[PDB]
Amino acid sequence: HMKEIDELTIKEYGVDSRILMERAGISVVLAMEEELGNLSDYRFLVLCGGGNNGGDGFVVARNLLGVVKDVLVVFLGKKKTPDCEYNYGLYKKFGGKVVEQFEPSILNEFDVVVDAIFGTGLRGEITGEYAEIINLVNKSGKVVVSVDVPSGIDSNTGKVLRTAVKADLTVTFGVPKIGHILFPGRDLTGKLKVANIGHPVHLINSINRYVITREMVRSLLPERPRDSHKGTYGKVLIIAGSRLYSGAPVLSGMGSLKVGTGLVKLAVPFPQNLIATSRFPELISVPIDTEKGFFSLQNLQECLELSKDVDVVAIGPGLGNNEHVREFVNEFLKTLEKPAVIDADAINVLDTSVLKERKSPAVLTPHPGEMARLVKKTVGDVKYNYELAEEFAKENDCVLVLKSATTIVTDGEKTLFNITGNTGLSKGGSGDVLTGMIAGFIAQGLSPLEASTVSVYLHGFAAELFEQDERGLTASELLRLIPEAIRRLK
Amino acid sequence: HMKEIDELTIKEYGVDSRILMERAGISVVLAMEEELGNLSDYRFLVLCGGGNNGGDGFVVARNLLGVVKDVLVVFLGKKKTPDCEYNYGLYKKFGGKVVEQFEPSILNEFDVVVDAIFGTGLRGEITGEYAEIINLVNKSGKVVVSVDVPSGIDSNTGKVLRTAVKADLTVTFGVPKIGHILFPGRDLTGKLKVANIGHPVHLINSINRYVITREMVRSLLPERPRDSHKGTYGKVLIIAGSRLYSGAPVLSGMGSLKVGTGLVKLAVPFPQNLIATSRFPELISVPIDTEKGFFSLQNLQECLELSKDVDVVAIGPGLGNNEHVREFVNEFLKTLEKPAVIDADAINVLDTSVLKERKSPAVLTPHPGEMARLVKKTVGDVKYNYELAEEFAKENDCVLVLKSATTIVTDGEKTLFNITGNTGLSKGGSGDVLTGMIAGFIAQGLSPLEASTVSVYLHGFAAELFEQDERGLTASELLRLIPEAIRRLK
């Protein structure tokens, strides 16, 4: 944890807290200079609370003195912490101007607002003056730079505590906080810079929750040895589709192939299985004879036989949710001694007892609506709830990939956040591609957690490479972009 | 003074000395990153003394820990000052490695030497171990970064105290020191960055000795109002040449014209006066009838008459030094109630009593050989001796422009240093151009000190604009480059 990293750095390593506070403020100044160019033309309004976030603000304000056109600090707190007091005292000795009353029109005479009111010490809702001032800053159209986290964002959840500052730039210290990563906070954060302010690198690295980065995904990508054959790159079985949902299998299957899997087999009710090969004849699409266009227990043995020859099985996209599908999915997963990727309708009928009793690994890929149904809570209680995700992964021995604009991937010990992608992925078909990608990377030798990490990243990055407006992106275009995403990764 | 600026910043403004020391070290790291690119590939050897320069080094070393390939500190002092001790303690708590014995081969395993042995606290000659280590670093071919001033450079004079470090990059704090500006120190300094480490800007600005900068010269350049005539831009008389030295007048005269003077008149012994107009027919070159090809008292009245109509008189280039020239120069300057620019042979025959008794202003433009003769000292005692220059300016009520690779310009209260130019100016004729430039800017309304500042700068910058090898630069090519220097200045 990061506030415990500050403490250790001060208390055990012996770095004066004033030194850390200085480094924080100057980082803010350099970050603004990098974003705004020469600062000397700009007039700055620094809004400072009475805590250490405000102390960081006093450092910023003092270091702009005599270099920029004008600086004014509006001090909004009651008491000052010792480091804030020290730095307030420096600002004044340096000739700085402070006021304690905020006049609505004061924004008119400034170009940049530095928001140092509340950082990680925010507790409860912002009300009264603090709130009226945040609302005025938000209506003002000025350039806003938030110190640490925008004021009003809960740094552990990304939730807005009644009201919050919308920043163009946020400079944070040590590591990104969860509140910069999850929405709405990610939105309010604007452009995020992470500054090194002198914490020991060992401590910064012992942080157990990470953003998935290009470097991390590059080093997880499996090797392609030249002397290889299709079996080197594994075999996937996808169990999917129904008479109602004939497209899902094709998108999942090509997801596996486009990430480099050697062989992909679909098991799909006849005659919907022919849809896949008419579009992509590289796929093997096995006809399953069903009574009414859905998988049922009558197909259990055929699907277990098809599983013997593969490395991983993906199940769920387009299966339909009725009782015969439920019987089949749960009896299948109960007997399949292969890694399983469980998506969509296989999640909706899943009995979680089945996951506990399985020797083999599983990845579950729900959206919040599916996760809500699965644990019997509301969407609002599960959305971006990474602790619930961790608990669930740990209890059921699986990897959980909880999909949203920020996707959470956890196995219970390690939790990762993905921030690639755009709103083009908020469209049917896009989850089916991801399920294939995951199965594909598992087939190639990646562990389930590694497979999930690499896939969520590349799936989002592929979407960003679409040439036209993102809202026109479809799952087929996304498939086409996957090999470009992989190439750009290296 | 700057060490008094540290004290005030700590003692009166209340900035913890540890904070200033931190800012200094991190500035060094950023400066290296800006010069070397990404630092993570490099192995660093930090040589630390026991004073605050070494403390700055410990800060550098600690901030490279875990970010670069390898860091080792070789601690070379006996005692540690309190801030050095604190920062040594931090380095170790951070996992840093220190040794106290320097093995000759230790350089083999490092790419960059950070030189934090002695800064402004250098006293007396470097000998023994300190010296053997500096010699080894100098023979090693590594990249060298000096903290504050290269170790072994006297920061007040630029002199080498027996031996000194030759740096590729020097990062200094607050302001350039005199030892970075004067040679040999300027040479040893390599590329110089001046870092802001948090001194109040008011104090940094109250420094009474400055490097002449492009910005300063731009704001001193006189205005060219559109509705103007030649008289707007003044009139210069140049009294120069002899039968032996017929070229000097032409170079001085065109120096005045090329900086924008309205009218230039030369007074030159017949028939050497015709040389000027055959080369530059824009010049007015008045024939002076002399007995033997040199000015003498017989010409005193003609030259005072020619002076009535001008704004400034330059005297000296190519006059010759014999007793009749001496009588004439001193009686002339004694009666001329106009600003005078006094160069070359007029300096060699000058009686300094004459300068004291003059109501009107003067600029003297000696090289060290001429300044030595003038005050009756050795070249070695006057070269780069800015305090002697200041004393002389103040006693004689003049501006002194003491020419060398770094030129000093002082009126006794304000002292400026010029660092433009190159070795192409170490060639006869080049001083004559400068004398004209100065007279020219005085004619245009600049005070003598302002005229001298702008001229030394532009004269050096013109030399840098020569397209071919600098050693082939001649005074005529230099004249041609002056208008380009002025244009580039804006």
């Binding site: 980082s27 350099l30 500054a195 | 950023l30």
Partner: peptide, 7 residues
Amino acid sequence: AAWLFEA
């Protein structure tokens, strides 16, 4: 060029 900032 990343000692101070990560993007």
